[PDB]
Design a protein around this ligand. Structure first.
Ligand SMILES: CCc1oc2cc(S(=O)(=O)Nc3ccc(S(=O)(=O)Nc4nccs4)cc3)ccc2c1C(=O)c1cc(Br)c(O)c(Br)c1
Length: 282
């Protein structure tokens, strides 16, 4: 397997840091003028993680359509993703407005609410069936329908209601709870399992709006998810599976959102995930 041989070559020469820096250098650079506007200061979690203006998701509300979220459109793989930041206390309503407006089926969460003893995002979904959430600013209701807690992840059924029209939708919350506080998983097994469980639900399928993916910043673990998914999809489609270049696919993705894959460790893991995912397929 061509990319596995490249993987092993980088490992032997210990050049993960150098390969990653090269990608960082070649990465696209686009304006984030809307994100930087003073009125949107409280709508961003990190100063250095902003959506490009050209691929940003726009809220269908007049006056301030801003949400820190980007549409990643992969033409060849025929797959779209919305990467966003973990909702802030003040952007929970915005978050679900987007989900509603973009006709999303699935929400993918790759972080725990608290990690390393700090809050990484707001508790933006109901933890108990009988305690529903109403978001007064965007006029939406959210109800926990069911919860399935597994070893490495948790799946939730949620009902999102548009209070204006009384229209309701079922939303699937896929929450990966076992990403380590430091570094990356030792084995891609559980991550790949999770990815394909997301796939199974139809949440990544063309008959629905784009999946909404987030970690804390919505670039690191988020990037790994999308990147692996796209690479594996490409290997299935192409006449020559060995032609799938993960660096090229990642550079392609970076045209839509900055900072996908934060460390050389994450890049290495992405490779691993694609390689191991391929060998399973087989
Ligand atoms: C690409 C999907 C996938 O890739 C994986 C890789 C691992 S792994 O990291 O342990 N690596 C691994 C493990 C086993 C093999 S193997 O080829 O020797 N065994 C099998 N291959 C196919 C069926 S049984 C090759 C590589 C574990 C589990 C998975 C797995 C799944 O979790 C998964 C796969 C499918 Br297809 C699916 O529908 C669902 Br749901 C989950």
């Amino acid at each position: 397997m061509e990319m596995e041989k490249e993987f092993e070559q980088i490992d032997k020469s210990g050049s993960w840091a150098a390969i990653y820096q090269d990608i960082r250098h070649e990465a696209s650079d686009f304006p984030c003028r809307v994100a930087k506007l003073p009125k949107n200061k409280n709508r961003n979690r990190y100063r250095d993680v902003s959506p490009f203006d050209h691929s940003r998701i726009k809220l269908h509300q007049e006056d301030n359509d801003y949400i820190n979220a980007s549409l990643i459109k992969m033409e060849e793989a025929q797959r779209s993703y919305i990467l966003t930041q973990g909702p802030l206390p003040n952007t929970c309503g915005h978050f679900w407005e987007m989900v509603w407006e973009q006709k999303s089926r699935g929400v993918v969460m790759l972080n725990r609410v608290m990690e390393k003893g700090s809050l990484k995002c707001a508790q933006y979904w109901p933890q108990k069936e009988e305690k529903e959430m109403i978001f007064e600013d965007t006029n939406l209701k959210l109800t926990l329908i069911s919860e399935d807690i597994k070893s490495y992840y948790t799946v939730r059924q949620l009902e999102l209601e548009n209070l204006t029209t009384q229209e309701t939708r079922e939303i699937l919350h896929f929450h990966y709870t076992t990403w380590p506080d430091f570094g990356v998983p030792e084995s891609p097994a559980s991550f790949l399992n999770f990815l394909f469980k997301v796939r199974e639900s139809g949440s990544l399928s063309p008959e629905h709006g784009p999946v909404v993916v987030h970690c804390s910043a919505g670039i690191g673990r988020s990037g790994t998810f999308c990147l692996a998914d796209t690479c594996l999809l490409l290997m299935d489609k192409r006449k020559d599976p060995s032609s799938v270049d993960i660096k090229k696919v990642l550079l392609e993705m970076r045209k839509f959102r900055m900072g996908l894959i934060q460390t050389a460790d994450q890049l290495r893991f992405s490779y691993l995930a694609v390689i191991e995912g391929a060998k399973f397929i087989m």
